Design an enzyme around this catalytic site. Structure first.
Site, mmCIF file in Angstrom:
data_model
loop_
_atom_site.group_PDB
_atom_site.id
_atom_site.type_symbol
_atom_site.label_atom_id
_atom_site.label_comp_id
_atom_site.label_asym_id
_atom_site.label_seq_id
_atom_site.Cartn_x
_atom_site.Cartn_y
_atom_site.Cartn_z
ATOM 1 N N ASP A 51 -8.652 -3.525 7.960
ATOM 2 C CA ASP A 51 -7.884 -4.122 9.048
ATOM 3 C C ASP A 51 -7.059 -3.163 9.900
ATOM 4 O O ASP A 51 -7.147 -3.199 11.131
ATOM 5 C CB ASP A 51 -6.974 -5.221 8.499
ATOM 6 N N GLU A 161 -7.407 -13.876 7.152
ATOM 7 C CA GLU A 161 -6.113 -13.672 6.508
ATOM 8 C C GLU A 161 -5.196 -14.849 6.839
ATOM 9 O O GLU A 161 -4.428 -15.312 5.999
ATOM 10 C CB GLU A 161 -5.461 -12.385 7.020
#
Ligand SMILES: NC(=O)c1ccc[n+]([C@@H]2O[C@H](COP(=O)([O-])OP(=O)(O)OC[C@H]3O[C@@H](n4cnc5c(N)ncnc54)[C@H](O)[C@@H]3O)[C@@H](O)[C@H]2O)c1
Length: 255
Positions: A51, A161
């Site tokens: 990420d 997420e």
């Protein structure tokens, strides 16, 4: 259905064009900086994970293009390493991003100091809560840097997420601008591949649920009941993390 409801709320798509999404995120960052000229820096914590590696590369591209197009040499992307005490993945990520500036801030001292203050108050933290405390100290450091460099804090939050709320409230969830929001986990890998990212930098999650399960769910596919229920449970439970502080005007929480 609840699945269709979640997909719409998070902006997830069944499939995406890597080049198009890369440009969407980069132009998003560029447009924001152009609209608020007092902003000179983009600040992002680098962990060596997928990420932050992806977000970091996009931030540097945005800055590179702006400097060439406007001639504004004061613009900079600042990568921040925030280790707790005592890097190969981080180093590899940094080499791939090639950030203008790299700062290293060890957060251990501040975390220990916070716990000593609480201990004197009669409160002993658990390892679990300490984990969230570390995330908030990292948020603190990034905002302090942004404050001294006229910058904004970039976040790595994305659909895979956000759906589970697996981030610390006002911790790594405390950011200013999130260029990856809408993408699922495998789609992030897709963008990194198109950016020629070293393969080892991007290749379970909880209660027997894997990222593949989460991504499939986000892509509108059919997943096992057990899996779907677990995912939907986490989502409903963490709605408070995806909204501003609750007021008497809110009704999303009423059951
Ligand atoms: N099994 C797993 O893999 C799993 C499960 C859960 C969390 N995690 C991880 O733990 C960390 C997150 O911990 P967490 O969410 O407890 O801590 P958090 O700090 O993110 O959220 C907890 C705080 O939110 C507030 N809060 C809680 N419920 C609320 C509600 N109903 N309404 C309004 N406010 C409320 C309270 O201040 C509470 O202390 C992350 O690293 C996450 O990935 C992992």
């Amino acid at each position: 259905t609840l699945q269709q409801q979640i997909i719409k709320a998070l902006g997830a798509k069944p499939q995406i064009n890597a080049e198009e999404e890369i440009r969407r995120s980069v132009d998003f960052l560029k447009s924001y900086l152009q609209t608020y000229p007092f902003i000179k820096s983009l600040v992002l914590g680098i962990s060596g994970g997928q990420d932050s590696t992806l977000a970091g590369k996009l931030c540097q591209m945005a800055i590179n293009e702006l400097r060439l197009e406007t001639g504004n040499e004061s613009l900079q992307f600042i990568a921040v390493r925030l280790p707790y005490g005592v890097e190969q993945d981080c180093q590899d990520a940094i080499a791939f991003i090639q950030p203008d500036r790299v700062l290293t801030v060890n957060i251990k001292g501040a975390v220990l100091a916070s716990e000593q203050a609480l201990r004197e108050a009669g409160i002993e933290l658990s390892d679990f809560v300490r984990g969230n405390e570390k995330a908030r100290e990292r948020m603190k450091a990034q905002y302090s840097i942004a404050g001294m460099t006229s910058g904004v804090v970039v976040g790595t939050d994305h659909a895979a997420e956000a759906i589970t709320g697996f981030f610390t409230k006002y911790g790594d969830g405390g950011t200013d601008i999130n260029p990856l929001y809408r993408l699922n986990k495998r789609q992030g890998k897709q963008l990194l591949a198109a950016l020629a990212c070293p393969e080892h930098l991007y290749k379970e999650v909880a209660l027997g649920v894997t990222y593949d399960n989460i991504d499939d769910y986000l892509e509108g596919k059919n997943v096992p009941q057990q899996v779907a229920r677990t995912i939907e449970n986490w989502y409903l439970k963490t709605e408070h993390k995806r909204r501003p502080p609750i007021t008497v005007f809110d009704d999303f929480w009423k059951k």
